[PDB]
Each structure stands twice: as C-alpha cells, then as structure tokens.
Amino acid sequence: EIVLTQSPGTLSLSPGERATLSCRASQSVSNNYLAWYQQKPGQAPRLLIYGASSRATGIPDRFSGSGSGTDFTLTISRLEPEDFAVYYCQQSARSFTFGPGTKVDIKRTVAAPSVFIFPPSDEQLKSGTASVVCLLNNFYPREAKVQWKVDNALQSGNSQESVTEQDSKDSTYSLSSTLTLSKADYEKHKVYACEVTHQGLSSPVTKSFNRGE
Amino acid sequence: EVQLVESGGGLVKPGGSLRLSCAASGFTFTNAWLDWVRQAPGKGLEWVGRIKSKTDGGTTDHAAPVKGRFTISRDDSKNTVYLQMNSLKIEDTAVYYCTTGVETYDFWSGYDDHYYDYYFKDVWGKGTTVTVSSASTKGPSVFPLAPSSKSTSTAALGCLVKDYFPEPVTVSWNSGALTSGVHTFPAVLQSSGLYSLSSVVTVPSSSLGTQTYICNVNHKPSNTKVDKRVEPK
C-alpha cells in the first residue's frame, strides 16, 4: 500500500510570499488519483485540488497543483492570511491514504523563550502527589525543547508537554512541560531543574529551585 | 444544499461497541461514494473505509487497522451510511467524519452529452467524537502555579488543572476579564488515563502585592466548578 510523505513538516512564510509544498508517493501513481486538502483548527478538511492539478469548485486561483509519477507540488502563488493552515496530500490509487501534513505558519523574527519553573504547590503535596511545571513562553520558531533534571540526573518517561497555536498578534508559541513525581520521590531529592534549548538563546537556559528553600 | 451529518459517537470502554451514522441530505447515494475519515487528537487524517454508490453495487472497503472490527453498511431507505465499530481500542479515539464528492454537469446547449462543463467539490460532516477509555468520571484538582517578584524572565503564574476525565474543562481568568498574557494549553492525557491541563498568565512582577489573579475552572461532567486565587509564595 502506498505511503505519502510530505516535506517540510512546517513551512514558515510571510503573507504575500509564494508557498511550494511537496508530496512524494512510495509508488508511482497516475495523476487522476492525487489530491490536496487544507485543514484549519476546529474544522473538517477542505479539498483544494483533485486529479493532481484541477481546482475544486470555489477554490481560489492562487492554489494550483502540479507534478506526476512520485513527485507532486501544491503551489500557493501569494499567501493570504487565511492560508496559514495544514495541507495534506491524498491518494486513491491503492487504497486511500493521506500524507502526514505540512503546516504553513507565519514567519517572524527569532524570539527566544522566557522560562519559568514552578515547584509543586503546598496544596498538591497535601493531596498526595507532586508535579513540577516549566513554562517556555513566547518563542519563535516552534522548535523549543525542554529536559528535566532531578539532583542532576536527566529524567525520562515522566514528563508531558503541550504547545499553543501560533499567537494571532505576535506570531509566537508557548510550551508547558510537567514533571510527574510521587510525593515520596519529590521529598527524596533536592534540586529540580528544567533545561531549555532554542535557536534564539545565546546559550541554553536552566531554571531551577531547591526543595524547601 | 448537499450536507452530511454524523452521529453516534460517545465514550466507550476498550472492547466496547458503537454504531456511527452518516445521514445525507440534498442527495442520495445512488451515484455517490461515502468515505469515513478519522483524526486522533493532535494527529493527521486517516481513512477508515469507503462504501461505493448504489449504481456500483454498494461495495465496501476498510482500512487494515480496523478490518474485521469496523463494518460499513447502508440503509437505502434512510439515505444513511453506518459504521459499526466493535472491539474498540484506545487508539481508535478520534473525531470521525464522513465525506463524499459531489459532481455536477453543465451540458452545452446544441451539442450532445459528451460536451459539458464539469464541477467537482467535496462535502464533509462536522464530525462525531469517539473516546475509548477505561477511566471513570473524575473532577480535577486545581493547583496554583505561584509567581514571585524574584522569578522574572515579567512574572508568571498559572493553574494546573490535574487528573480529570473525560474532556473538556474550560479555564478563564478573573471571570473572563483577563486575557492579556494568558496561555491555556492543550490538555494532555496522562499514563493514568486522566487528563491534565495547564493555564498560565504573564504579569508585572511589581504589582503582585495588589493585583488579583483567579483561574475559573469548570468540569461539567463532574459538576466541578472551582475558582482558585493564585497568590505569591
């Protein structure tokens, strides 16, 4: 069965720029089987292009499709603000599959995250558990990462994070990470730190606290 | 107007069963196929199955991950397609859409039927949500993320809305009067099967002794409503 791959994962462009999105098929397909979809948060997908190059009814002229064989391209001749969205290619030649999606986000200048660490609250400790939170605020582009250390030991498997959508005014992202510990483990150790990497930092950032100080 | 409406979603235990319906209006399935497509939280699109038009005999095809467990069928008298879902798995959790293509022909006057302008566009329902989980209903704890004038990077504060099931929770600040600097993050699903959501605000550090910040949390499934005043430590 045919696998569709898309590159890049995220394309960062300004309104008014030409966008070029790539779809590759793991087996060659005839053009009649290749389509492109757009999807915005909270909405069903919308067909843009079918048969590799035909516009669906009501789709603006700035969207076009090209390519053949194993290599297909969606072009947006001039990006409008409503075009920052996720784009999926799709094929019906062998079964029916989608590509993984390319997100088109708004390009802005690099902004380093501001980092904040929060110990478990006294209320949570009374309730019997312990969560440490690290906030990475208002950064661009999206590729900020965070790791946790407890008494200088890197943690694995006990953290979860999520990320906001791009801000409508300043075009930044924010990310929060939570380290989940048992209360006994939290009381067993002293130094809690999150280490943050991002291309806007002159050096990675550590925020830390000592339990009970 | 051509329209599709999904129904029949819900919360179901692993191993359980649901039957989704896709009701068409403004057209029938005599010459139109019907696809089911799903989207897991934060993930891409995945085709689930297709039933062909009545003209093509209503043949069905299903994606490998659901073969033998999910079955598409149609009640022609109702213009409705069903998705019978058995042996449900936690990875079947998703929004389920039905979708089809609508062809229209504008035939040229004075020519024969081989001459026409062809129009094509898709139609999708709004979706129905399927959640497969072993967890039982639980309201969240609302824990403060306390600021400090010595922890500036502005100051930051928040609420950790921890250990609830099912979705959703809503969070506002100061009864909706405060949105500047607010970030409310997507919920995460913990290894326990309970959800957790964080909401934060960045604020001036030099007014923490006189400004009030309250997060307003509502978890309707458990009738939990909690306002948590977040104070400096």
Distance CA B163, CA A118 (A): 18
CA gap A178, A183 in Å, rounded: 14
Q: Are residues B59 and B143 in the same domain?
A: no
- Count of other CB atoms within 10 angstroms of residue A128: 9
Range of the domain at B221: 135-233
Tokens, residue B137 = 């209903």
Residue with structure tokens 């290894």?
B191
| Residue B110 near residue A47, CB atoms below 8 Å | no
State how far the Cα of A70 lies from the Cα of B172, in Å rounded to an integer: 48
Domain finish residue from B112, B134, B156: B134
Token pair of A213 as six digits: 């100080």
A5 close to B87: Cβ distance less than 8 angstroms: no
Is residue B63 domain-shared with residue B118, that is, in the same domain?
yes
Q: Work out how many domains chain B is built from and give that number.
A: 2
Please name the residues in contact with A97: beta carbons below 8 A apart, sequence gap of 6 or more: A1, A2, A3, A4, A90, A91, B47
Q: Are residues B129 and B168 in the same domain?
A: no
- Test A95 with B153 for CB contact under 8 angstroms: no
Question: How far is Cα A6 from Cα A34, in angstroms, rounded to an integer?
Answer: 13
Tokens describing residue B94 = 């998703």
Q: Are residues B77 and B105 in the same domain?
A: yes
Q: Are residues B26 and B124 in the same domain?
A: yes
Q: How far is A15 from chain B (nearest CA, A)?
A: 25
Q: Are B38 and B129 within one domain?
A: yes
DSSP-derived secondary structure for A131-194:
EEEEEEEEEBSS--EEEEEETTEEP-SSEEEEEPPPPTTT--EEEEEEEEEEHHHHHH--EEEE
Alpha-carbon distance A21 to A7, whole Å? Answer: 7
* Beta-carbon contacts of residue A160 (< 8 Å; ≥ 6 apart): A177, A178, A180, B188, B190, B196
Give the whole-angstrom CA distance, residue A184 versus residue A159. Answer: 17
- The residue out of B82, B115, B134 marking a domain boundary is B134
The DSSP bridge pattern shows strands B80-85 and B70-75 to be: antiparallel
Q: Indicate the SS3 state at residue B166.
A: coil
Tell me the HSE value of B146 on the side-chain side, using a 13 A CA sphere. 12
User: Parallel, antiparallel, or unpaired: how do β-strands A102-106 and A86-91 relate?
Assistant: antiparallel
- Which CATH number fits the domain that encloses residue B212? 2.60.40.10
Cα–Cα dist A24/A40, whole Å: 22
Nearest Cβ partner for A135 among B61, B162, B200: B200
Beta bridge partners of A180: A131
Alpha carbon A165 to its chain centroid, in Å, reads 8
Nearest to B162, CA basis, from A160, A135, A21: A160
Min Cα distance A41 → chain B (Å) is 10
Q: Decide which of B134, B167, B199 is a domain's last residue.
A: B134
Does B143 lie in the same domain as B98?
Answer: no
Alpha-carbon dihedral B138, B135, B93, A179, rounded to 10 degrees: 70
User: Is residue B49 domain-shared with residue B145, that is, in the same domain?
Assistant: no
**Is B198 in contact with A176 (Cβ distance < 8 A)?**
yes
Distance CA A61, CA A45 (A): 19
Same domain, B40 and B121: yes
CA distances from A65 to A62, A81, A99, B131, B158 (A): 10, 20, 15, 36, 45
- One of 2.60.40.10, 1.10.150.450, 1.10.1370.30, 3.60.10.10 is the CATH number of A1-108, namely 2.60.40.10
B205 and B155 in contact (C-beta within 8 Å)?
yes
Is A1-108's fold the same as A109-211's? yes
Q: Domain residues of chain A, as ranges?
A: 1-108, 109-211
Q: Specify whether the CB–CB gap between A83 and A19 falls below 8 A.
A: yes
CATH architecture of A109-211: Sandwich (2.60)
AA letter at B105: Y
CB contact (8 A) between residue B183 and residue A45: no
Please give the C-alpha separations between residue A143 and each of A14, A199, A200, in angstroms, as whole numbers.
18, 8, 10
Burial (CB count within 10 angstroms: exposed 0-12, middle 13-18, buried 19+), residue A200: middle
For residues B48 and A180, give the distance between their C-alpha atoms in angstroms, rounded to a whole number: 35
DSSP B108: P
Helical (H) or strand (E) element with B3: strand B3-7
Mutate one of A2, A96, A138, A165 to test the B interface: name it (highest B CB count within 10 A).
Answer: A96
CA-nearest of B105, B101, B96 to B123 is B101
Q: Report the candidate in B138, B140, B139, B147 with the shortest Cα–Cα distance to residue B229.
A: B147
Residues 6+ apart with CB under 8 A from A143: A198, A199
Whether the CB-CB separation of A12 and A67 falls below 8 Å is answered with no
A46 touches chain B (CB under 8 A): yes
Tell me: do B118 and B210 sit in the same domain.
no
What does the alpha-carbon distance between residue A64 and residue A48 come to, in Å, rounded to a whole number?
8
Say whether both B32 and B62 belong to one domain. yes
Instruction: Among A97, A115, A175, select the one facing B47 at the smallest CB separation.
Output: A97
Count the residues in chain B. Answer: 233
Residue of B nearest to A125 (CA): B143
What would the two tokens of residue B78 be?
């109702």
Find the distance separating the first CA and the last CA of chain B, reported in whole Å.
59
Determine, for residues A98 and B153 on separate chains, whether the beta-carbon distance falls below 8 Å.
no
Q: Which of B140, B175, B150, B208 is nearest to A123 (CA)?
A: B140
Q: How far is CA A117 from CA A44, A209, B59, B114, in A?
A: 37, 8, 57, 69
CA B36 to chain centroid, in Å, comes to 15
For testing the chain B interface, which of A176, A178, A183, A186 should be mutated: the one with the most B CBs within 10 Å?
A176
Cα B188 to Cα B195: distance, rounded to the nearest angstrom? 6
Using a CB-CB cut-off of 8 Å, the residues of chain B touching A135 are 156, 158, 200
Rounded Cα–Cα distance for residues B17 and B69 (Å): 9
Other Cβ atoms less than 10 A from the Cβ of A195: the count is 17
Pairing of strands B214-219, B170-173: antiparallel
Give the integer Cα–Cα distance in Å for B233 and A208.
16
Beta bridge partners of B231: none
Q: What is the DSSP letter of A119?
A: P
Cross-chain CB nearest to B144 (options A121, A137, A164):
A121
Shared domain for B151 and B60, answered yes or no, is no
Instruction: Tell me the three-class secondary structure of A52-112, residue by residue.
Output: CCEECCCCCCCEEEEEEEEEEEEEECCCCHHHCCEEEEEECCCCCEECCCEEEEECCCCEC
Q: Is B181 in contact with B203 (CB distance < 8 Å)?
A: yes
CA dist A125 → A56, B77, B149, B173 (Å): 57, 60, 23, 24
Strand partners, B172: B216
Of the candidates A31, A30, A22, the residue with the CA atom closest to the CA atom of residue A4? A22
CA B79 – CA B62 distance, rounded (Å): 20
